Design a protein around this ligand. Structure first.
Ligand SMILES: [Zn+2]
Lengths: 64, 95, 80, 103, 97, 97, 78, 105, 91
DNA sequence: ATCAGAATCCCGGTGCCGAGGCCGCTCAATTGGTCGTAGACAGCTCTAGCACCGCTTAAACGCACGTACGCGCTGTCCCCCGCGTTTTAACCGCCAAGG
């Protein structure tokens, strides 16, 4: 079953903190970051061990 | 709050003119707004081609007339040209 | 007058053969003439309207090019 | 307002603004938007007049878009105009090939 | 003599006209028809020849496409003889009413 | 008892020329569209109004293409559709080469 | 997948088209042509959203892509 | 390199295209990389289609490209044919479409 | 009133360097080039007005070339354009 | 034709909800005033569109005539309509045992 989790991460674009939601679909190995404020979205691959800090880390490197 | 556009009140008044006892749905009002958008866009594109096939950059009403009777079919077009021309006379005759 | 009847049956034949048509019925020719006529009606109406705004009593190749681009039957070859 | 001074119903200066921001030319004349607005005005008058007749047919008071699509598909020149046009909640002509009607 | 029950004539001339390059309708009667249609909306109009050649080009192309889809309509009709309502169906589907 | 065929179909043609409501219902159509876009890009949250737009345009598109295909078959001295009819109509419109 | 298209759906498509009698291979042929249609549409739609630098395809971009294929649809703000 | 064409190593005039954009009523301002980018796309399209032109003209032992060659090379392509679907070439004609029901069997 | 003739000659000598051409072939080619230029440019202007961006950079041109030409042509064209951007940007 | 009976139409009914009125804002249309060149216009020049004809000839027209695809008919055989029978997509309420 999918996991819809709220986090305390800051969006890299709109800068609103505590407004990034992480949807981890392990059945298809696809993780999804969403911003509850400016509405941006970022997709990245996840394994079985990953957690909201794993894809949020991949989002920091995808920008820089 | 960003201010968005509609043409709803204008054509709404026109509808009230031509049919006082008539209601309308909201989606259809949006459809008519899109209708005005589309017709305006085709006209304006023909106006830009009028410019570039005439090597001029001024727009007068004459170009609008020839654009309309390029786009629209004949009888409807000539009635519309009549309406626009009489409006040109009534406006520019006064200030 | 009657240049609509200037369309010849062997010309329609030749057009069918380059068109690849083998067998020709007899009830085809005037129907063909009518369709060709309506086509050229809309074409030359629009070309002459382009020349109406041109304020020149002569229509150019460029005019017909622009008009047929307006119909979306757009033809290259002569510039425009 | 110039529209009232033209005795019409569409706002001139909004159209004059949109002609500027459309990169439509370099300069914009005086009364060209008046002519264009009147063209729009007669077009929508004719369209919605047939739509009003379409509502008269079904004895409906509020216009549904089905009325709009029907009135487009009835008139000749309008349907040749909007040939490449479709509308959500449109539908088509109630039309039956009578060669497929039974005997 | 060599009368030849048919088949080579039509298809051979198809081979010739598809080896071909140039036009088929000859110039003058087409030009006069153009001027007769032209004499209907604004009188007394003059023309350069390249416009007329473009008109002839696009005319023959338009009719060639009509003939191609008409031919495929006939092939689907399990016939080789064309019919007029073939052309009417073709223009029905082309949206050019 | 048993009704004789062809009748109920035309009666529901007269019924289904009335309501312009969407024929394909939402969820499976949405899954198909999502499974398609994914092939072009990932993480693309669809506006639901855009999904309704896709649904409308798709259904009207297919209905009109059916109308031309039906008229092809009526020309083809038959009543029932064939896949070759769809091929003929598409060959006239020019989707496939 | 593509088999989420039911038989009575394409039948209803024939009905609003007004088509009476139905063959067999029609169904899979229909799904194929619908697929290619949606392929081109959603491809250039996602191209629009790629230029938008945003993660959600707008309904506007759908409308403009329909305009780009000459398939102009009113109704939804276009 | 004085000229931007030599600074791009290409064959088209870029400032031509930039003036075309300026005398286009296209945008209000035009950047520096867009005209170069578009001209490069144009140059690729020319070379790509002229490849099929060269082979199609070489099919008939003729040094000169004729319009029939160009129409043949377009229709023998797939992407260019779906590109040029509403498009007609002067002196073009169409492909050899001899149906199988027609040959004497 | 310039046509693109020697540009065509140089492309031709870069591809099939033993190849002649007729006059009207060149005419159809320049017709083609003008059509393509107009279609892309107008689509880019649509990109601006649909996106409220007061000018146009190369990224708009890339996405417009995506919007017009299909896959293989599009990808090779994007490659050639970015390579030209690279070599012009280096010097 | 002709009756029985499915199928659909069509008339109060009520409900609920959004179309439309309405009302207080503020930002673009306006109003007025100031440069400026694009174009409306006068006018110069040479091209080309037009008309005409004489000569050449290949191209159309009419007919002779067989003939063979187009077609009406036929039998046939089969496979979609449809109505019936489950049946599963789609969508809300309980046991796991681990925390
Ligand atoms: Zn954000």
């Amino acid at each position: 079953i999918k996991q819809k989790l709220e986090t305390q991460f800051t969006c890299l674009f709109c800068n609103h903190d505590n407004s990034v939601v992480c949807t981890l679909d392990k059945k298809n190995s696809i993780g999804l970051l969403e911003c509850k404020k400016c509405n941006l979205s970022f997709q990245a691959p996840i394994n079985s061990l990953s957690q909201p800090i794993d894809i949020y880390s991949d989002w920091i490197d995808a920008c820089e | 709050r960003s201010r968005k556009e509609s043409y709803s009140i204008y054509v709404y008044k026109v509808l009230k003119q031509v049919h006082p006892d008539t209601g309308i749905s909201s989606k259809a009002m949006g459809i008519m707004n899109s209708f005005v958008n589309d017709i305006f866009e085709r006209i304006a594109g023909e106006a830009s081609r009028l410019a570039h096939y005439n090597k001029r950059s001024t727009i007068t009403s004459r170009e609008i007339q020839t654009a309309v009777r390029l786009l629209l079919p004949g009888e409807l077009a000539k009635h519309a040209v009549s309406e626009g021309t009489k409006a040109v006379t009534k406006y520019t005759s006064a200030k | 007058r009657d240049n609509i009847q200037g369309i010849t049956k062997p010309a329609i034949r030749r057009l069918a053969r380059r068109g690849g048509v083998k067998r020709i019925s007899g009830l085809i020719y005037e129907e063909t003439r009518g369709v060709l006529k309506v086509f050229l009606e809309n074409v030359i109406r629009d070309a002459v309207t382009y020349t109406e705004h041109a304020k020149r009593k002569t229509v150019t190749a460029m005019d017909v090019v622009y008009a047929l681009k307006r119909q979306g039957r757009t033809l290259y070859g002569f510039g425009g | 307002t110039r529209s009232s001074r033209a005795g019409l119903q569409f706002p001139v200066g909004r159209v004059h603004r949109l002609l500027r921001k459309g990169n439509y030319s370099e300069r914009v004349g005086a009364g060209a938007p008046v002519y264009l607005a009147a063209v729009l005005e007669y077009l929508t008058a004719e369209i919605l007049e047939l739509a009003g007749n379409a509502a008269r047919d079904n004895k409906k008071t509020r216009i549904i878009p089905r009325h709009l699509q029907l009135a487009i598909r009835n008139d000749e020149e309008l349907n040749k105009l909007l040939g490449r046009v479709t509308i959500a909640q449109g539908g088509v002509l109630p039309n039956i090939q009578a060669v497929l009607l039974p005997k | 003599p060599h009368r030849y029950r048919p088949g080579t004539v039509a298809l051979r001339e198809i081979r010739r006209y598809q080896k071909s390059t140039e036009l088929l309708i000859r110039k003058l009667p087409f030009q006069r028809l153009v001027r007769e249609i032209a004499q209907d909306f604004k009188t007394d109009l003059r023309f350069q020849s390249a416009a007329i050649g473009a008109l002839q080009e696009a005319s023959e192309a338009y009719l060639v496409g009509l003939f191609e889809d008409t031919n495929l309509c006939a092939i689907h009709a399990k016939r080789v003889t064309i019919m007029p309502k073939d052309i009417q169906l073709a223009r029905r589907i082309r949206g050019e009413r």
